[PDB]
């Protein structure tokens, strides 16, 4: 069986070559446990790479490109064999073939090489695969090509350390057009690619925003498929980690009522946790951005999550309420208190996460300054919010934080007690 396939690919007869390349392809196209290792050991990989350059025989090109796609879909050691036989520059060249079938297979193959690791991803981009990949993207592009290329594009952006920004910047106009598709697969892969490009410094977020993605990304927060929603939510969340102007791009497109609906629907814990992290990066902004959070009606259900939800959700909801106390106005902080935020912030003071203790302590302190301003202005006998902290059992918790190992938590507790309980 196999010594006839090797002889066929190693023969110089066009029909013998196509017959055994189809046989090798079929053997590599099997469901689970493909004999990729045995196909490599048969010494046929360099012949398939040679069969890629045969532009007078497009059927063999496609069969050889599909067999190499499946070898490149295995282990890193299998992907390296494809790289060592110089397939990467030949697949970039095959993106300019008269055959739609060869172009599509070359796109998949490069996606599989770029998918292996940041090193392999970097080799594909250094071989200039990005521009010709984007060149076969237009209004006459078939759905199968739109899906293969959008998935390859996501692999070009994928991994840590991230690719150079100048290297993935040409992708942004194409990705902004691809998120307008109604195909869930295209949407999933374009959202994944945008979640990678937006994960970083503010100069990256700025370019993502200038491509005009914010209105369509907000709409995608309401996509019924979680496959779309997960990278959509992550992209929105990465954009709002930028400056106030960058964060405003998302808020202007009614994202806050959309983010609220993710907190009130019967959704996965990981989706609610991400919505809370997103909201927290918005309450980390200016007084107008906090107002928009208040206006959307998020504070109420956020305070309930801060009190009743699973620890990972409570963590993000803690950062969201505390951020609002940090940048917020006097009357906004008071609105947070009237929505019942003091008790749940107090209850997380004995929490084993020192970061969360510090966040809730800062939130309670910010609230205390406001309560003090009300006392001074009205010549009152007591700080109303210091009474509420004591009623919520928060006072005894702050007094106990004087025994905490952490200096920052200790020094905070002492500073709070000296300024409000002497």
């Amino acid at each position: 069986s196999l010594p006839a396939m090797i002889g066929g690919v190693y023969s110089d007869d066009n029909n013998l070559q196509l017959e055994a390349t189809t046989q090798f392809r079929k053997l590599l196209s099997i469901e689970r446990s493909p004999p990729i290792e045995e196909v490599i050991q048969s010494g046929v990989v360099p012949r398939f790479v040679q069969f890629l350059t045969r532009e007078d025989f497009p059927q063999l090109q496609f069969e050889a490109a599909w067999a190499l796609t499946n070898i490149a879909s295995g282990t890193s050691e299998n992907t390296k064999v494809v790289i060592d036989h110089g397939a990467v520059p030949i697949f970039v060249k095959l993106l300019g073939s008269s055959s739609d079938d060869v172009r599509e297979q070359a796109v998949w193959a490069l996606g599989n090489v770029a998918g292996d690791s940041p090193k392999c991803r970097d080799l594909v981009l250094a071989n200039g695969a990005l521009l010709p990949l984007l060149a076969q993207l237009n209004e006459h592009t078939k759905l199968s090509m739109l899906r293969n290329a959008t998935w390859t594009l996501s692999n070009f952006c994928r991994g840590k350390p991230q690719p150079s920004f100048e290297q993935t910047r040409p992708a942004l106009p194409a990705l902004a057009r691809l998120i307008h598709s109604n195909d869930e697969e295209v949407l999933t892969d374009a959202c994944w690619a945008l979640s990678y490009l937006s994960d970083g410094t503010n100069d990256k977020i700025q370019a993502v925003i200038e491509a005009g993605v914010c209105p369509r990304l907000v709409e995608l927060l309401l996509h019924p498929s979680p496959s779309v929603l997960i990278p959509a939510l992550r992209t929105v969340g990465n954009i709002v980690t930028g400056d106030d102007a960058q964060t405003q791009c998302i808020i202007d497109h009614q994202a806050l009522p959309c983010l609220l609906s993710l907190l009130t629907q019967n959704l996965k814990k990981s989706i609610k946790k991400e919505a809370c992290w997103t909201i927290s990066n918005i309450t980390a902004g200016n007084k107008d951005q906090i107002q928009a959070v208040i206006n959307a009606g998020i504070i109420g259900p956020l305070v309930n999550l801060l009190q009743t939800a699973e620890f990972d959700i409570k963590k993000e909801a803690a950062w969201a309420i505390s951020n609002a106390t940090s940048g917020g106005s006097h009357d906004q902080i008071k609105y947070l208190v009237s929505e019942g935020c003091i008790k749940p912030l107090c209850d997380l003071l004995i929490c084993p996460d020192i970061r969360i203790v510090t966040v809730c302590l800062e939130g309670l302190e910010n609230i205390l300054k406001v309560g003090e301003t009300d006392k001074t202005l009205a010549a009152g006998d007591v700080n109303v919010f210091s009474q509420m902290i004591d009623e919520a059992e928060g006072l005894e918790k702050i007094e106990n934080l004087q025994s905490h190992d952490n200096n920052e938590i200790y020094e905070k507790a002492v500073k709070i007690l000296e300024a409000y309980w002497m």
Binding site: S73, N155, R158, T188, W192, T241, N281, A284, S326
Partner: peptide
């Protein structure tokens, strides 16, 4: 404060895809 916090959990699609047909 307040400070903007980047994502601390790794979220990504499928690295490789095998062509079955």
């Amino acid at each position: 404060s307040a400070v903007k916090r980047p994502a601390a959990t790794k979220k990504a699609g499928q690295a490789k895809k095998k062509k079955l047909d």
